[PDB]
Amino acid sequence: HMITLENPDIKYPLRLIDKEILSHDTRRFRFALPSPQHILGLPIGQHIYLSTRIDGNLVIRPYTPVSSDDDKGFVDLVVKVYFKEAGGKMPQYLENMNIGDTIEFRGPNGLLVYQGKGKFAIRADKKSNPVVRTVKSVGMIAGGTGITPMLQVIRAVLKDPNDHTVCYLLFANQSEKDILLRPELEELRNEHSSRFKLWYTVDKAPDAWDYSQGFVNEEMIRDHLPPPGEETLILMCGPPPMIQFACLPNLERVGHPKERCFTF
């Protein structure tokens, strides 16, 4: 394997090769890897950082590519750009990049690594040896672009026909139009209904809505995520308030132990 991210401390300027508008505020930003034969080299569960100086300050933000190490030659980021009404500087930077412009990628980073077959290696910190535990059910609470760390895991699980792990995604977004990667998710769900449960909640639901509405709550966690247990791991990725006010307290009320919860 020609690995792009050979050194986690290296900032690899990768050229933007295409920008694709996916929705009113999200897009696919594809960057060329060092050669068409390269793969990113991003363990499942980890992310990369984009960094560049914006208005004189180094801006470094995490992104979990929606591409995988099966993809050669490019890395695909699904990025939400924040159109007004904290800064969204990096997405805006990406938004303003012209094709061929470079931005620095670094990685892999992340305290959690899905080793496959339900095995998650989670490090207390960068310097700690991961605690490896095998679970059978991975609950995933994603808010908006927090879907990418989840999708990376889901896809890893699902592409392994021998991975019996069942992923339960509770995907929260502002509105139906904001359900990022819905087609991707639903196809995964349609094709792997046994190992992938999918549920949505939107802050504002359309008049006709078959899913949940509102911030994630206990009921959604209790009913759309696996129950607390030694074989359950809950993963979370979403806005800080989502984590702090919609996830943590309800996971607690549902009974999910902090140690069987991981937040990207």
Ligand X SMILES: Cc1cc2nc3c(=O)[nH]c(=O)nc-3n(C[C@H](O)[C@H](O)[C@H](O)COP(=O)(O)OP(=O)(O)OC[C@H]3O[C@@H](n4cnc5c(N)ncnc54)[C@H](O)[C@@H]3O)c2cc1C
Binding site for a second copy (CB under 8 A): 2, 6-7, 10-13, 15, 32, 34-37, 100-102
Nearest CB to ligand X, comparing residues 204 and 258: 204
Is 51 a binding residue for ligand X by CB under 6 A? The answer is no
- Report the nearest approach of ligand X to the CB of residue 119 (Å): 19
Nearest CB to a second copy, comparing residues 15 and 136: 15
Q: Which of 12, 63, 93, 200 is catalytic?
A: 63
Judged by CB under 6 A, which stretch of 5-13, 49-57, 120-128, 241-249 contacts ligand X? Answer: 241-249
Is 174 a binding residue for ligand X by CB under 6 A? The answer is yes
Is 263 marked active-site?
A: no
Q: What is the per-residue DSSP string for the chain?
A: -EES-S-TT--EEEEEEEEEE-SSSEEEEEEE-SSTTEE----TT-EEEEEEEETTEEEEEEE--SS-TT--SEEEEEEE--------HHHHHHHTPPTT-EEEEEEEE-SEEEEETTEEEE-SSTTSPPEEEE-SEEEEEEEGGGHHHHHHHHHHHHH-TT---EEEEEEEEEEGGG-TTHHHHHHHHHH-TTTEEEEEEEEE--SS-SSEESS--HHHHHHHSPPSSTTEEEEEES-HHIIIIIIHHHHHHHT--GGGEEE-
Nearest CB to ligand X, comparing residues 66 and 136: 66
- Report the nearest approach of ligand X to the CB of residue 259 (Å): 19
Is 261 marked active-site?
A: no
Is 247 marked active-site?
A: no
Is 64 marked active-site?
A: yes
- Report the nearest approach of ligand X to the CB of residue 174 (Å): 5
Is 264 a binding residue for ligand X by CB under 6 A? The answer is yes
Cα–Cα distance measured from residue 103 to residue 93, given in angstroms and rounded to the nearest whole number: 9
Report the residue from 13, 83, 193, 245 that binds ligand X according to the rule CB under 6 A: 245
Report the residue from 148, 165, 212, 250 that binds ligand X according to the rule CB under 6 A: 148
Q: Tell me the catalytic residues.
A: 47, 63-64, 237
